[PDB]
Design a protein around this ligand. Structure first.
Ligand SMILES: [Cl-]
Ligand SMILES: [Cl-]
Ligand SMILES: [Zn+2]
Ligand SMILES: [Zn+2]
Lengths: 187, 187
């Protein structure tokens, strides 16, 4: 049976950090739902790329559970994720059921906002470190991708492929991740 | 004055190869127009990401000239670009006026279709080599990004950042490309 991914898409999300994981996960045969935080309407990303989500979050959250919940970054996208009661509930459920949570760039700061995964080793974008580390609830890493059990984090646009492939490996295994990786022409 | 980029977005385009250059060029202060080949309506990309273009190609081509014309890849996107009389005319004009043309992955095969840049050294995705090389009108390269004067090509999703930064360097210079690059957390 195919694994399922929920990608939560908010206004101001970093479009690269959204699209790269969606695409790579779909290459890995994962059923990806791109869910609009605000509703069903198109989402204006940080660099003005406009993406039409597959469903509202309100609807998509009724079709869980998901094998991974993915939080893109983008400063303003992450803030929107951080403020969302709906996101809080989704991440708490995902944590409670021992499901994977993956967050990139400023995305992990939503984990702090919703008190998720405290005690984990995590990375973020360098500019989001101080926000993430407020209170000392995580241990900081400078690895490009950091996986501490069911909390998987990464640093920025330029780590998006490694982040996505890490999600693929966690869900579908090392062999599928390698197979998906080879046609991408990664260095 | 700000440089201008036309990114031609067809059904079946590779969404990563579309979004990465758009975003990175906008970081570099380039005015990017994402133009829908088929018209103004949202475009279903190769991995089902749906992007709302800024304008139809029909409209955007009236607001030229552009400092670069960018052709994303994706097998079916590139075929759509290759079949387009409108694209043919845009690329011929761009070539005639000595403007940059940038194409990635299967995207360069549209150059062959429209008889653009013959004699250039070019790269493509490995799987698109034989198509591109039909007739021997180009010289093939395995470099991740190949720039032969005003013809700039690259290989795949995983070379999209290097491709985008090469476009930035060609338009706005090495210093701006370096400045844009550093926050991306590229390896
Ligand atoms: Cl941002
Ligand atoms: Cl493709
Ligand atoms: Zn980011
Ligand atoms: Zn491609």
């Amino acid at each position: 049976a195919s694994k399922r991914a929920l990608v939560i898409l908010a206004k101001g999300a970093e479009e690269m950090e959204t699209v790269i994981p969606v695409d790579v996960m779909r290459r890995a045969g994962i059923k990806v739902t791109v869910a609009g935080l605000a509703g069903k309407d198109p989402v204006q990303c940080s660099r003005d790329v406009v993406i039409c989500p597959d469903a509202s979050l309100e609807d998509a959250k009724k079709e869980g559970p998901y094998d991974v919940v993915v939080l893109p970054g983008g400063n303003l996208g992450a803030q929107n994720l951080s403020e969302s009661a709906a996101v809080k509930e989704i991440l708490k459920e995902q944590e409670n059921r021992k499901g994977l949570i993956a967050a990139i760039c400023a995305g992990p700061t939503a984990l702090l906002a919703h008190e998720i995964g405290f005690g984990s080793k995590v990375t973020t974008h360098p500019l989001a470190k101080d926000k993430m580390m407020n209170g000392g609830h995580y241990t900081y890493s400078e690895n490009r991708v950091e996986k501490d059990g069911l909390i998987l984090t990464s640093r920025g646009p330029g780590t998006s492929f490694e982040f996505a492939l890490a999600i693929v490996e966690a869900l579908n295994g090392k062999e599928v991740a390698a197979q998906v990786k080879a046609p991408l022409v990664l260095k």
